[PDB]
Amino acid sequence: NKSQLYPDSPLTDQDFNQLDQTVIEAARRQLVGRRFIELYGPLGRGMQSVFNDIFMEAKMDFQGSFDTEVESSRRVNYTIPMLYKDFVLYWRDLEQSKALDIPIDFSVAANAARDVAFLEDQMIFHGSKEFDIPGLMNVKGRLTHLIGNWYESGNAFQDIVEARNKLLEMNHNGPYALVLSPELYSLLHRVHKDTNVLEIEHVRELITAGVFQSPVLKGKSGVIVNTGRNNLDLAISEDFETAYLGEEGMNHPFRVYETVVLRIKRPAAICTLIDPEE
Amino acid sequence: NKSQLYPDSPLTDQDFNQLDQTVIEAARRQLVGRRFIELYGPLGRGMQSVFNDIFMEGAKMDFQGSFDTEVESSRRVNYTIPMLYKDFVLYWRDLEQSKALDIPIDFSVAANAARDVAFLEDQMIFHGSKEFDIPGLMNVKGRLTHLIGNWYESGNAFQDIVEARNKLLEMNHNGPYALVLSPELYSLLHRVHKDTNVLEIEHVRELITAGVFQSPVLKGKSGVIVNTGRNNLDLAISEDFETAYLGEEGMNHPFRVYETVVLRIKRPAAICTLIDPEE
Amino acid sequence: NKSQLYPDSPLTDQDFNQLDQTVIEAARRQLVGRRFIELYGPLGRGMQSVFNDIFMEGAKMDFQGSFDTEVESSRRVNYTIPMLYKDFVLYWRDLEQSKALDIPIDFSVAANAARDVAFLEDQMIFHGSKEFDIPGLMNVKGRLTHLIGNWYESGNAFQDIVEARNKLLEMNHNGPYALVLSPELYSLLHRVHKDTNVLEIEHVRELITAGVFQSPVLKGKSGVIVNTGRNNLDLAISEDFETAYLGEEGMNHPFRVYETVVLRIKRPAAICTLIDPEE
Amino acid sequence: SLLHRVHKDTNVLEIEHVRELITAGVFQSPVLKGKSGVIVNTGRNNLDLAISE
């Protein structure tokens, strides 16, 4: 397939395959949001916009009635953004490696992969200002809750129970996912008093799903979200891809890119734990 | 193979293959530097110098695109590959008795030479070599130093580690980190921490996530935290451990072991060093 | 054995198999030292003496190497192999009664003798033989002694073990460690470890990583921690446990058992001892 | 939610003993508003449900 899209690229097909594998491998480790969120199928290049319906928040009788009742959907429109990063190579080193029969080195692309992954995660968690795309901690009706000291007495279990209670009352049940800062993640390994087990073991039983930490969150904070389709979804247009720009001088420049957006239908499936001091 | 390469060697290939294993195992048990550093592929015999690039200094989001690219300061430099070696000696009278009585031969000596050559490699990796002007991890520029308080108290170490983590995070090196400490500091972590009833090492390992190691080469109140992965640090090796006959001096048979390695650091800002106060 | 080597014997070939099986089964359980020490291959009866080289406590880098060879010095000593034996006697009237009544015979005395000789072997290994002038583990030059106090109040035992491991690590000896203690110290460790809520023995076992054993040879408060490895220590066995029939006596049949072994300690620095406090 | 607290000096959770006594499981429904509980003996004869379609 390659060497047809880019006839002028000095790199051969096998080298291109190695470059692509190295690029994807670095991102595979770094990506964390996709673990508990589904994904919409690739839509191609035909669409540059998407439509989302937001739901902010019978008939028991005998056979009969001739009418239809529907509820409002609050239709809104979104635009897909683009993220890119680039790197450069040289010619004398490639010639020397070809002469000495030594495999080529592609170390630089790892930095670009890490940087684009760290921006995709931040865009998912906090949103984008220019396109007015809401973030997980910015949606209205997010059902906030307040936390207390976690250093002593093991109040983490009670806080988790109280947080789950509000969702249970609002009738959102099923699998839950909890994401918290590394500082709070560390403290969970303390022993539970009068039981002598680790509180993380007790919390896992209620959570019934993976508990992970992310560097994007800075202060002491956390989020618990009900996990299912028709509550939130991720729509991708183009996956991670690498292109070769026109050569200038004697060197060769490259670039990477991908396009993705997020949609949230039901704002009431999420709960946010806030520190009183924060 | 070896019998053809060395015709006048007294030892046969059956002994030579065993000697190779005895040499390699001692080095494997004694090398700590290679634990968290990647290795460049063996370049070959026909090279003695390498080139290094020092940047010494975020992704873009747009709708239409961009009409320009971005670059950085290469600052290319050149380095040369040194060699290290050590030697041992066998005796002929002992060999004669073993050959006569069918007793197994002994190859204990090679382990000491392997251990000694590994020790010097560790020392060069940590401190650095003056003769060839190759900088080391401890003394390189842009080390992003940090300071520590009294660790005899229970809770100071955790806060000190968190502060260094934040310093690296603001400097935008985010990823797995590896920590190397002196034996004195490593011992102190094995103490009961109050208010949690758990040893401090368990808490520290949750944040480090890549292991903690201790090395005797450091001398008192020192430590280093380095962001792992390639594109920041690398090790270039041309010829690995090897053993060679040396001649027939007197009636005895001498052998030698040799290896060549070098170290490269591309981005200096990754390394952070903790230093003691009132030094 | 096989009834051809020993004619004129009352016991039959099939019963000789039971006798040797009982002897080896009894001998196996009572030996502790052979668990963590390697064994030199049997030499046959050809050799009656051995040689030992005692090192008793550097590499250089050059672009092209040097024209000279340097080797480390050592000291050579000679050792002789002692013999250990014990004997037991059977009776004829019981054998005749067993033949008449078709009742299986008993061989408890062989097991008792095996236990006694096994105890003597461990005594010799731990304390040494003055007559043959062979040193032992407890009394050697350069054993890196340490002083222990208290050991009644919970974590004090853990602290001493940590400090001893630190001293062993300081001399560039990092590896699996083997700890041997007296029965009283073995019993004392079972108490809970203060506020950690877990038993103290588990942490010591995790640190040691090669297991902890107790021996009745040690009398009071005594402990030894040794680095394992082929080069540090070795055991040379001339012949294993064997049974011999001396010959008829005044209507009774006597037997004996014998075995021959010796110990070599190449590097003294590895061993560390926890000497008792003022006594 | 209230049952999740520890059972005094028994050192185990209170919910486990209730589950052992009940032996058929405990469920929660949003239909009940305040403080309400129902305990029923299972069996074919006691109750039945008839579904037309």
In what helix (H) or strand (E) does residue C252 lie, and over which residues does it extend? Answer: none
Say if the Cβ atoms of C170 and B116 lie within 8 Å: no
Angle, CA of B132, B138 and B140, to the nearest 5°: 65
Q: Which two tokens stand for residue C154?
A: 């919970």
Q: Which two tokens stand for residue B3?
A: 């019998």
> A109: which residues sit within 8 A by CB, 6+ positions away?
A19, A22, A23, A26, A87, A242, A254, A256
**Residue C159 buriedness (CB in 10 A; 0-12 / 13-18 / 19+):** middle
Q: Which two tokens stand for residue B35?
A: 């634990």
**Experimental technique of record:** cryo-EM
Chain B positions touching C163 (Cβ under 8 A) are: 187
Q: Which chains touch D (3 or more CB pairs under 8 A)?
A: A
Residue of D nearest to A194 (CA): D11
Candidates A23, A28, A82, A95: best to mutate against B (most CBs of B within 10 A) is: A82
Round to whole Å and give the CA distance between A172 and A165. Answer: 10
Read off the DSSP letter of residue C266: S
Strand, coil or helix: B237: strand
CATH topology of domain A144-230+269-274: hypothetical protein PF0899 fold (3.30.2320)
Cβ-contact D17, D4 below 8 angstroms: no
Q: Which residue has the tokens 């094995």?
A: B190
Task: Name the resolution in angstroms.
Answer: 3.6
User: Could you tell me whether strands C212-214 and C177-181 are parallel, antiparallel, or unpaired per DSSP bridges?
Assistant: parallel
Round to whole Å and give the CA distance between A209 and A227. Answer: 9
CATH hierarchy code of domain B145-231+270-275: 3.30.2320.10
Please name every residue paired with C77 in a beta bridge, in sequence order, or none if there are none: C52
Chain B positions touching A114 (Cβ under 8 A) are: 175
Neighbours of D33 (CB within 10 A): 6
User: Could you tell me whether strands C223-227 and C212-214 are parallel, antiparallel, or unpaired per DSSP bridges?
Assistant: unpaired
The one-letter amino acid code at C107 reads F
In what helix (H) or strand (E) does residue B7 lie, and over which residues does it extend? Answer: none
Please name every residue paired with B83 in a beta bridge, in sequence order, or none if there are none: C62
Buried b (16+ CB within 10 A) or exposed e, B4-15: eeeeebebeeee
Instruction: Count Cα atoms within 13 angstroms, Cβ side, for B240.
Output: 10
Phi/psi at C225 (nearest 5 deg)? Answer: -120, 125
Among D4, D6, D28, beta carbon nearest to A194: D6
Phi/psi at B263 (nearest 5 deg)? Answer: -125, 140
Q: Which among A278, A267, A227 has a CA at the least distance from the CA of A143?
A: A267
* Greatest alpha-carbon span in chain B: 86
Round to whole Å and give the CA distance between B16 and A14. Answer: 40
Instruction: Count Cα atoms within 13 angstroms, Cβ side, for D31.
Output: 4
Chain B positions touching C196 (Cβ under 8 A) are: 192, 197-199
Say if the Cβ atoms of B87 and C65 lie within 8 Å: no
Round to whole Å and give the CA distance between B84 and B124. Answer: 11
Number of H helices, E strands in chain D: 1, 0
Say if the Cβ atoms of A171 and D30 lie within 8 Å: yes
Cβ-contact B56, B268 below 8 angstroms: yes
